[PDB]
Amino acid sequence: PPYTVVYFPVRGRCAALRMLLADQGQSWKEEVVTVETWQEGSLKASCLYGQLPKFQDGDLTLYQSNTILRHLGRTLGLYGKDQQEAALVDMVNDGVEDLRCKYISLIYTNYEAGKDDYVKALPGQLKPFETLLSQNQGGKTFIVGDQISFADYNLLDLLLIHEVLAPGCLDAFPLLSAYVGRLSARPKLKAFLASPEYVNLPINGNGKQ
Amino acid sequence: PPYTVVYFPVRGRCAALRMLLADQGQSWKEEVVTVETWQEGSLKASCLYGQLPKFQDGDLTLYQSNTILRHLGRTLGLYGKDQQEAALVDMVNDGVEDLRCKYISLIYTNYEAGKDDYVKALPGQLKPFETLLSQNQGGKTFIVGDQISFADYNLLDLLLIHEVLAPGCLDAFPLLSAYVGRLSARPKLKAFLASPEYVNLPINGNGKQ
Numbered sequence: 001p002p003y004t005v006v007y008f009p010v011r012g013r014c015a016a017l018r019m020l021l022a023d024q025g026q027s028w029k030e031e032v033v034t035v036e037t038w039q040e041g042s043l044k045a046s047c048l049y050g051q052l053p054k055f056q057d058g059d060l061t062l063y064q065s066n067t068i069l070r071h072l073g074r075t076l077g078l079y080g081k082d083q084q085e086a087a088l089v090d091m092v093n094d095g096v097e098d099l100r101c102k103y104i105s106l107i108y109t110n111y112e113a114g115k116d117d118y119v120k121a122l123p124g125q126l127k128p129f130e131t132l133l134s135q136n137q138g139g140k141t142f143i144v145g146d147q148i149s150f151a152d153y154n155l156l157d158l159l160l161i162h163e164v165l166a167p168g169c170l171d172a173f174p175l176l177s178a179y180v181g182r183l184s185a186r187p188k189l190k191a192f193l194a195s196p197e198y199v200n201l202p203i204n205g206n207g208k209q
Numbered sequence: 210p211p212y213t214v215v216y217f218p219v220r221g222r223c224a225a226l227r228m229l230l231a232d233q234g235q236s237w238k239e240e241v242v243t244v245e246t247w248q249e250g251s252l253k254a255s256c257l258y259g260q261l262p263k264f265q266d267g268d269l270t271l272y273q274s275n276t277i278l279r280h281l282g283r284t285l286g287l288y289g290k291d292q293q294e295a296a297l298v299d300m301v302n303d304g305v306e307d308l309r310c311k312y313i314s315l316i317y318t319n320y321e322a323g324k325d326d327y328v329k330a331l332p333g334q335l336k337p338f339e340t341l342l343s344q345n346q347g348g349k350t351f352i353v354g355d356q357i358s359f360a361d362y363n364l365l366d367l368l369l370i371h372e373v374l375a376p377g378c379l380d381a382f383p384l385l386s387a388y389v390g391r392l393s394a395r396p397k398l399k400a401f402l403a404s405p406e407y408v409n410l411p412i413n414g415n416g417k418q
């Protein structure tokens with residue numbers, strides 16, 4: 001640290017890393033980028049891949065949400081207990097990322113027309129995570145191992161936003177359902193999820209969810 | 210080890226991890242999955258996210274190409290010299306992944322119609338990596354630090370396939386151009402890139418490139 005999150009006034013790709021920081025008792029600064037500032041071009045041009053989030057950790061400047069998650073993950077000890085667990089954490093996170101990309105595609109590309117189809121395919125997309133849970137202490141702890149990892153936060157956010165998109169989409173998945181309520185119940189996390197900082201921010205930037 | 214790569218008879222998302230194995234002097238088994246075997250459904254159903262590559266490392270079974278790259282990366286010591294370098298390696302790899310996704314989209318979704326546009330935007334997509342290089346020992350070594358990492362292999366493959374898509378797309382990028390020739394010149398890598406094992410495999414599965 002100190003940590004600084006440079007992003008638009010949305011939860012989006014910063015929601016999970018924010019939950020991580022909050023739950024780990026970390027302090028950070030939120031640098032909010034309005035549309036006007038982005039449309040002007042200066043900031044965008046300075047970003048490596050021309051996109052936000054931009055993360056500051058002392059003298060270290062990072063880009064890419066998953067790079068930030070892995071950074072906070074290895075640095076804060078939320079990346080598995082060993083190399084094998086670390087690989088499992090990656091496999092989970094990679095899966096979460098694939099579905100997030102499909103979700104964002106729906107939201108920004110063809111929400112109205114493609115929504116029903118997306119919802120039909122959803123259970124097949126959630127299945128893998130339910131399976132992962134059933135293989136780890138009967139799904140009573142975390143997604144990988146007995147300790148929480150950055151993949152847990154990313155998975156939790158994914159499940160939360162999909163529940164807003166299709167309420168009750170977790171009803172057919174017992175372990176996933178229980179996993180969300182359990183994680184969401186974590187003191188520092190519960191406090192964050194209920195805060196104006198989280199609640200008063202739209203999930204996405206186009207008003208859809 | 211032992212390592213086993215279960216994949217279709219294409220370079221695709223296994224090309225980079227194969228270059229890594231080869232260049233590091235590693236031995237592995239190639240389990241080739243024909244269309245008939247995949248269309249039958251048994252293997253697909255057993256895959257976590259229903260897709261290949263599937264990787265075997267002794268008793269460890271992994272899925273997701275980047276999970277395999279990171280696995281081989283941390284296990285073989287190709288993941289930066291410290292935590293900061295490791296995060297930079299992720300940032301590079303995340304960027305390579307974003308562009309690979311755009312490329313695959315072109316190849317399978319609308320190659321014919323969207324090709325020219327993709328090629329127009331290409332330099333803006335390659336720029337970040339040229340910049341990364343200019344900031345690391347003047348681009349004379351690797352993408353991050355003085356040692357090679359899994360991100361190097363993934364970046365090299367990306368550059369190779371784009372050069373096949375748009376020959377000379379690296380002509381405006383001196384460091385990227387030099388970086389490819391240098392890496393491609395590496396003994397074990399050069400030997401692999403020239404082999405029937407690599408050469409006689411199509412870049413993609415739809416005959417396009």
Ligand SMILES: N[C@@H](CCC(=O)N[C@@H](CS)C(=O)NCC(=O)O)C(=O)O
Binds near residue numbers: 050053063064065307
């Ligand atoms: N792969 C990147 C995606 C970043 C991204 O898509 N950023 C968007 C907002 S969520 C952005 O900055 N859009 C502005 C633009 O591209 O003009 C990540 O993982 O962070």
Ligand SMILES: N[C@@H](CCC(=O)N[C@@H](CS)C(=O)NCC(=O)O)C(=O)O
Binds near residue numbers: 221262272273275
């Ligand atoms: N995100 C995955 C992508 C895997 C993937 O797209 N696999 C394709 C081949 S490149 C596949 O198995 N397609 C068969 C299917 O989905 O039916 C990774 O990084 O490996």
